[PDB]
Design an enzyme around this catalytic site. Structure first.
Site, PDB file in Angstrom:
ATOM      1  CG  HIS A  71      -1.938   1.083   1.259  1.00  0.00           C
ATOM      2  ND1 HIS A  71      -3.283   0.841   1.451  1.00  0.00           N
ATOM      3  CD2 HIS A  71      -1.810   2.427   1.152  1.00  0.00           C
ATOM      4  CE1 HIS A  71      -3.937   1.990   1.466  1.00  0.00           C
ATOM      5  NE2 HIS A  71      -3.066   2.966   1.287  1.00  0.00           N
ATOM      6  CG  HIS A  77      -1.329   6.876  -1.693  1.00  0.00           C
ATOM      7  ND1 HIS A  77      -2.584   7.008  -2.251  1.00  0.00           N
ATOM      8  CD2 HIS A  77      -1.497   6.173  -0.548  1.00  0.00           C
ATOM      9  CE1 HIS A  77      -3.471   6.409  -1.477  1.00  0.00           C
ATOM     10  NE2 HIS A  77      -2.837   5.894  -0.438  1.00  0.00           N
ATOM     11  CD  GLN A  83      -7.755  10.756  -1.326  1.00  0.00           C
ATOM     12  OE1 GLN A  83      -6.533  10.613  -1.251  1.00  0.00           O
ATOM     13  NE2 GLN A  83      -8.591  10.294  -0.393  1.00  0.00           N
ATOM     14  CG  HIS A 118      -7.841   4.221   0.967  1.00  0.00           C
ATOM     15  ND1 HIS A 118      -7.336   3.683  -0.198  1.00  0.00           N
ATOM     16  CD2 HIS A 118      -6.829   4.927   1.526  1.00  0.00           C
ATOM     17  CE1 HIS A 118      -6.073   4.050  -0.339  1.00  0.00           C
ATOM     18  NE2 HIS A 118      -5.740   4.805   0.694  1.00  0.00           N
ATOM     19  CD  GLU A 149      -6.596   6.613   6.216  1.00  0.00           C
ATOM     20  OE1 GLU A 149      -5.456   7.040   6.526  1.00  0.00           O
ATOM     21  OE2 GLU A 149      -7.057   6.676   5.058  1.00  0.00           O
ATOM     22  CG  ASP A 182      -0.885   5.119   3.520  1.00  0.00           C
ATOM     23  OD1 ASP A 182      -1.650   5.429   4.459  1.00  0.00           O
ATOM     24  OD2 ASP A 182      -1.220   5.248   2.328  1.00  0.00           O
ATOM     25  CD1 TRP A 234      -3.388  12.081   4.239  1.00  0.00           C
ATOM     26  CD2 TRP A 234      -2.465  11.858   2.208  1.00  0.00           C
ATOM     27  NE1 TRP A 234      -4.343  12.420   3.305  1.00  0.00           N
ATOM     28  CE2 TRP A 234      -3.802  12.292   2.051  1.00  0.00           C
ATOM     29  CE3 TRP A 234      -1.683  11.649   1.063  1.00  0.00           C
ATOM     30  CZ2 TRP A 234      -4.375  12.521   0.793  1.00  0.00           C
ATOM     31  CZ3 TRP A 234      -2.253  11.877  -0.190  1.00  0.00           C
ATOM     32  CH2 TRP A 234      -3.585  12.309  -0.312  1.00  0.00           C
TER      33      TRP A 234
HETATM   34  O1  LIG Z   1      -7.409   8.462   1.829  1.00  0.00           O
HETATM   35  C1  LIG Z   1      -6.165   8.403   1.881  1.00  0.00           C
HETATM   36  N1  LIG Z   1      -5.269   8.870   0.915  1.00  0.00           N
HETATM   37  C2  LIG Z   1      -3.821   8.762   1.061  1.00  0.00           C
HETATM   38  C3  LIG Z   1      -3.298   8.190   2.143  1.00  0.00           C
HETATM   39  C4  LIG Z   1      -4.189   7.683   3.162  1.00  0.00           C
HETATM   40  O2  LIG Z   1      -3.970   6.237   3.006  1.00  0.00           O
HETATM   41  N2  LIG Z   1      -5.567   7.833   2.967  1.00  0.00           N
HETATM   42 FE   LIG Z   2      -3.491   5.020   1.358  1.00  0.00          FE
END
Ligand SMILES: O=C1NC=C[C@H](O)N1
Ligand SMILES: [Fe+3]
Ligand SMILES: O=C1NC=C[C@H](O)N1
Ligand SMILES: [Fe+3]
Lengths: 423, 423
Positions: A58, A60, A153, A211, A214, A310, A316
């Site tokens: 995981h 980005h 997203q 996702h 979270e 991540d 983030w």
């Molecule tokens: O919604 C998200 N975007 C990027 C990182 C985090 O995992 N959460």
């Molecule tokens: Fe993520």
């Protein structure tokens, strides 16, 4: 033209082993009764640990290396992060995405990672990052097998043409369908978004990685819909629920009821310790919750759970070198998996469990598999974790694709002495 | 015969600087307008960061390297830890303590640590570890200034002859008076133990460092007595409250009232992130509290707080390589000091703030001070922390006492490429 890996230690096995290679594959694995002599075409593991490649389940890559542009996430929350990313997403260019993704991918190759699953934001009519990432996927293939998750997203039902863009991303080649139910405007949109996500995965024969929950909200239970739909479609192996940080805040009775379904469904779970400890608990004053999903309990129940980094220097998360042993170190501490055996078995969370999460078909040190493996200059998983060792050699298709000459530390006492931090 | 440190970056300062050395001291510090050429007797920092030595304000060298002997701490709690240590304490020998303390001290020298404060359990009529540690203190002096805390692990009033043994430890030479009020049988014994601790510190002119409120009990408030007694005696600078993990669980109103006294008292605080995240929160189910004291708020209020490793492979912690940047990394994450500036300023928590905690009189890169400094191959505190860099050179009295030749990583793409993880 490597023919053998000698003097190798293997997790859970006693003694030393020899791994014979032929035509880019592992032809046979034989135990040794003592130390074997080096020779031409033999890679000496030197009694170090040999394991299949580290995996990044995981990350980005479309946002990596962008922390502070145009502004910094001051609150350290998931929500401001999305808003800060939105500002940067508006300034993306094809080459910009490719350059940054490649910079992080090189760090991953250096860190023995040969399998990576990157989410890519597809709440963008231009799909700029996705087009760039599809090219990066082809370019990096000789060193890393990159999976791309079409990640909506800003929501599927809560963003203009969100569902259409998600499907367009799959038609362009994304390997995995993503979703973010807790970010949708309503609980109903959240549940409906999951039905749509599963229908697309079945329509195109793709994997799923949501996702999921979270957020520090004890009422965020989208994970039960993810698991139920997977069980219904008989596709658990192809499904992943990322984060599930809300589970850290559930009452125990509901969690117990839920666990039966999690196990029966067979879906995978990803915890992202470095980012979770930073972004979760931000709405508490004191005491402050840790916010990582129930990793320890999943392991005890035989539920597949693994760790991802991540984010690497983005909205983030301001840190990182894309190092999986570092991710594991944080996870073991926050999840209190600190018993000797739990620490030693920790490697599973960044190797085999992650491979299962990515539904990999050619992974592991076994006859017939491609010769993809890495060598750690350590005695076992515990030692590797404690000393945060680098990857001595990374082998792919039977060829060395990365190597690290270890640092050399000396203390000058009455006489010079080498220090290796071992006991 | 070093005469100068050139091309040095300094925290909070712009540009490069030259540090002139004379007779084992820093004679002058001058800014450079460009890169200076290397030469004989010049140590080139190569635009790396130069800072005074790392400091270990809280460690247990008498228990180090003993995890699992005779048994393992299965619950991962402070309480079972003390009980597991009690079993090992009964098997101590002079040479055993010296060998283990020295093994960890060598790792510390290798990690640029030149100042260490070790607690030593004095709830032992034979004072075996203390006698051994007093010799180690003399032996390691050329490389590390070691302070010894007479630590009554099983209590002052709750252990047979506890107060007598504590005073005997001071008469033998311990530099600091310790205490553990939350472990005493009653709240009254806890408070009384602090009056006795302060009286001994004044009688012998020694520092104080209390294992204070290391427990997830919102009613454990011995810290207010520690601060009040220090204020009364006008000795804040000489006093330290270690842990104060209970503060993580206090209601906000009491904490606000308390902070006025903490600031007025001038006492020091030590947080031990690697151990605190592991031992605290063990009585919660879910959610689980982090359990580190209020570091972020102390910094915002100008209250001196710093980080210690606490334990290295013993009953309270199975990991560690005695690395302060690693301790800092954990602390920044758990305490959510993740803003760029907070991370960059993080070095203060393992350098200057710790020096103040140890009441050091010769510390810092300033004219007239001993030439004790270390060189990190990084641009600033943020970079050093992110990449967890080793100590390139450790200089003491103007001489190199440790050096690390950095690891060299290469990835073999279309062409070989060096990877240094920098952006
Ligand atoms: O919604 C998200 N975007 C990027 C990182 C985090 O995992 N959460
Ligand atoms: Fe993520
Ligand atoms: O009481 C304690 N002994 C040792 C470590 C921990 O700091 N606490
Ligand atoms: Fe301690």
């Amino acid at each position: 033209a490597l023919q053998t890996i000698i003097n190798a230690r293997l997790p859970g096995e006693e003694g030393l082993w020899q791994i014979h290679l032929q035509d880019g594959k592992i032809s046979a694995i034989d135990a040794q009764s003592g130390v074997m002599p080096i020779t031409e075409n033999s890679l000496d593991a030197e009694q170090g640990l040999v394991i299949p490649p580290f995996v990044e389940p995981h990350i980005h890559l479309d946002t990596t290396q962008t922390a502070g542009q145009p502004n910094w996430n001051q609150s350290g929350t998931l929500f401001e992060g999305i808003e800060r990313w939105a500002e940067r997403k508006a300034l993306l260019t094809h080459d910009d995405v490719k350059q940054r993704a490649w910079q992080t991918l090189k760090w991953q190759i250096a860190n023995g990672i040969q399998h990576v699953r990157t989410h890519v934001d597809v709440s963008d009519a231009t799909l700029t990052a996705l087009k760039a990432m599809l090219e990066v996927k082809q370019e990096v293939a000789p060193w890393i097998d990159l999976q791309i998750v079409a990640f909506p997203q800003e929501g599927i039902l809560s963003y203009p043409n969100g569902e259409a863009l998600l499907e367009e991303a799959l038609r362009l080649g994304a390997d995995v369908v993503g979703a973010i139910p807790h970010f949708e405007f309503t609980r109903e949109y959240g549940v409906e978004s999951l039905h749509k996500t599963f229908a697309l995965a079945q329509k195109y024969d793709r994997l799923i990685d949501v996702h999921c929950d979270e957020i520090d909200d004890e009422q965020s239970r989208f994970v039960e819909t993810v698991a139920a739909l997977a069980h219904h479609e008989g596709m658990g192996a192809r499904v992943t629920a990322s984060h599930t940080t809300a589970m850290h805040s559930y009452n125990g009775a509901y969690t117990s009821r839920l666990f039966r379904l999690l196990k029966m469904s067979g879906i995978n779970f990803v915890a992202n310790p470095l980012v979770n400890i930073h972004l979760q608990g931000r709405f508490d004053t004191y005491p402050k919750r840790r916010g990582i999903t129930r990793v320890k309990e999943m392991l005890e129940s035989g539920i597949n759970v693994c760790f991802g980094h991540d984010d690497v220097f983005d909205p983030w998360y301001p840190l990182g070198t894309a190092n999986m042993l570092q991710v594991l170190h944080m996870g073991l501490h926050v999840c209190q998996l600190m018993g000797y055996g739990q620490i030693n078995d920790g490697l599973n969370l960044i190797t085999h469990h992650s491979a299962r999460t990515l539904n990999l078909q050619d992974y592991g040190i076994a006859a017939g598999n491609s010769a993809n493996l890495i060598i750690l200059p350590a005695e076992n998983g515990f030692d590797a974790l404690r000393r945060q060792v680098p990857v001595r050699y990374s082998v792919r298709g039977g060829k060395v694709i990365a190597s690290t000459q270890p640092a050399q530390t000396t203390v000058y006492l009455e006489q010079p002495e080498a220090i290796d931090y071992k006991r």
